[PDB]
């Protein structure tokens, strides 16, 4: 099962260097680098029989690979292009057709830095109507105005991430469809029992990880550097 | 030359229903076949393989596939699909000589609609904890579909299914917002086929 | 009457990429050979009905070989590990597969087996479901192949294609 990609998330700008790593603790001889984009499914970039071998795949242009050792396979984008923004999967194998996948590395390569903004995050508090009518309180989180669509949203209740009772839009929402590098919005819900929301020693936090510019990208805009960051919104229980 | 073909990219069925995902393979002797699944935000997992022998292959999670030489068929089947089986399903053959490489299908995105036992359509309003206004359409049934705003300036999300597992409870939800000074909860989802049934809290509307 | 088909591959590592070789037989007659040692590395059909074939047939065949070679190179190294052998030396992994069909046309026995450095290494039993492992290294391989489903992979071939081809071949004669 243990095939592990690093890094899970990555943003860079056209011309940059990107290096996706993949480690496998099986003693598999084959390793593979795939990309995945909607409308193209899984496409093979490069693979390898074993240590010190490389084979070209179906869409190798723009990528190099290195199989230094038995368990480490690297993908290298030496001059990154917007085309390459995508989701990458590593896989090991020890038999025809049987691949064991890693978890994904999501990479955005940005053409124009002027377009990057972090999300604004707001939490909205559960309708009283809902609480009385159904005995349940639904909180809604709203993250808005962020480009590029590279965020990860999570609910924190009392210092621990919670998963039960949470739905987060699978697809984001273009603020302006007509503009083509539009900023995005994205919504999420956490539902809990009325008794729970009503305890006012309950802390609710909506946390959005933004993946954006790096410490050493130059920034020439009269607004804050839309750098990689966390943006949150809080709320506390009420007994009403 | 050895391809495999999956007929449908999108597919939806209801919690409990029985599932058949179609996979046809370009002719080859002797065929080696696979089904992989991809759960949201994850990689691919091998479901099952057919190398030889019993043409009915038992995968894990009560999945199974049937190798039909007659058809050039490798259909994937499950008897009673739960909701957690919503995922993308990939068919794949391992060509011979082209064997180090695995050749994938396009994929099939499977959506298992949860069974809403006691539907209670309602459109409540939620207020910003710091300031701002959002409208929430919730608790509707699987059949009800929410559609986008013909207003542009008003934002509406798709349905999302959330599951409070501690209480064995699932529910749908759409969300809408705008800062048109004009704009109200009642008028929000009106560009949809809402149930006659659905509640509207009187003050909030 | 009865008939047989055999195909042998050998890969020999070098002190200085491995010298790969192959040769096929039906009924104790050669029908093709390959050697990455003659100036051109190309398959040499030895039988009239094979010689008359499209050169895009022999292309795909060749493409497959380049893979198989790369497989041999990797696994040859897998063996030197198993046997604690010096990196500088010369070793030979050899592989044979094929089938015997009887008077009836029904498969009578299938083969899939490797020998390493002259000595038996591993071999698919007449059952086509189990492996016989010469030594401690071989059992490791067997375990991998047991869990990977190797035996099933090759049953499919042996019971089906291996027999179907021998037949067409004998008929083309």
């Amino acid at each position: 099962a243990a095939v592990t990609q690093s890094p899970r998330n990555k943003v860079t700008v056209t011309g940059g260097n990107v290096t996706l790593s993949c480690r496998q603790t099986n003693s598999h001889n084959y390793m593979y680098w795939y990309r995945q984009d909607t409308g193209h499914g899984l496409r093979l970039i490069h693979y390898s029989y074993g240590a010190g071998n490389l084979q070209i795949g179906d869409v190798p242009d723009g990528y190099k690979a290195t199989r230094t050792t038995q368990e480490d396979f690297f993908l290298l984008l030496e001059l990154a292009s917007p085309s390459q923004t995508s989701l990458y999967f590593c896989a090991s194998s020890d038999a025809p057709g049987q691949l064991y996948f890693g978890e994904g590395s999501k990479l955005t390569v940005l053409e124009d830095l002027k377009n990057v903004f972090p999300p604004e995050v707001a939490v909205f508090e559960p309708s009283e109507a809902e609480i009385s009518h159904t005995q349940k309180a639904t909180l809604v989180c709203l993250a808005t105005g962020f480009y590029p669509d590279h965020v990860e949203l999570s609910w924190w209740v009392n210092g621990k991430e919670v998963h039960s009772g949470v739905c987060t839009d699978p697809q984001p929402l273009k603020e302006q469809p007509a503009l083509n590098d539009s900023r995005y919005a994205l919504s999420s819900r956490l539902r809990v029992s009325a008794t729970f929301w009503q305890n006012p020693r309950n802390h609710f936090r909506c946390q959005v990880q933004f993946y954006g510019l790096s410490e050493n990208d130059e920034w020439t805009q009269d607004r804050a550097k839309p750098v990689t960051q966390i943006v949150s919104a809080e709320a506390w229980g009420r007994a009403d | 030359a050895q391809s495999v073909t999956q007929p449908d990219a999108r597919v939806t069925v209801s919690e409990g229903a029985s599932l058949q995902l179609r996979c046809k393979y370009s002719y080859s002797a002797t065929p080696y076949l696979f089904w992989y699944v991809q759960y949201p935000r994850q990689g691919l997992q091998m479901l099952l393989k057919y190398y030889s022998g019993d043409p009915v292959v038992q995968g894990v999670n009560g999945f199974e596939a049937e190798f039909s030489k007659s058809d050039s068929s490798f259909h994937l089947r499950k008897a009673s699909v739960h909701w957690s089986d919503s995922a993308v399903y990939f068919c794949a053959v391992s060509a011979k000589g082209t064997g180090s490489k695995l050749s994938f299908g396009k994929g099939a995105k499977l959506t298992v609609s949860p069974n809403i036992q006691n539907p209670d359509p309602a459109v409540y309003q939620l207020r910003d904890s710091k300031s701002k206004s959002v409208c929430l359409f919730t608790d509707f049934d699987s059949q009800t579909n929410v559609s986008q705003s013909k207003d542009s300036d008003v934002y509406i999300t798709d349905k999302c299914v959330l599951d409070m597992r501690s209480m064995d409870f699932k529910s749908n939800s759409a969300v809408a917002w705008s800062n048109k000074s004009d704009f109200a909860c009642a008028n929000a989802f009106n560009n949809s086929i809402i149930p006659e049934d659905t509640f509207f809290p009187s003050p909030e509307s | 009457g009865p008939h047989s088909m055999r195909y042998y591959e050998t890969a020999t590592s070098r002190r200085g990429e491995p010298r790969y070789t192959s040769v096929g037989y039906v009924d104790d007659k050669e029908f093709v050979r390959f050697d990455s040692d003659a100036e051109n590395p190309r398959y040499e059909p030895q039988v009239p009905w094979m010689e008359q074939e499209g050169p895009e047939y022999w292309e795909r065949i060749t493409q497959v070989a380049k893979g198989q070679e790369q497989w041999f190179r990797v696994n040859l190294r897998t063996l030197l590990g198993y046997y604690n052998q010096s990196a500088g030396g010369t070793h030979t992994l050899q592989r044979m597969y094929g089938c015997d069909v009887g008077s009836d046309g029904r498969l009578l026995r299938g083969y899939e087996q490797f020998a390493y450095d002259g000595c038996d290494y591993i071999a698919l039993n007449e059952d086509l479901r189990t492996w016989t492992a010469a030594d401690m290294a071989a059992q490791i391989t067997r375990r991998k192949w047991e869990q990977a489903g190797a035996a099933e992979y090759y049953r499919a071939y042996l019971e089906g294609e291996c027999v179907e081809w021998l037949h067409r071949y004998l008929k083309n004669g």
Binding site: - | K96 | W71, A150, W165
Partner: peptide, 9 residues
């Protein structure tokens, strides 16, 4: 004909 061999050792 061909029955290539790819399983690890």
């Amino acid at each position: 004909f061909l029955s290539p061999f790819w399983f690890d050792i």
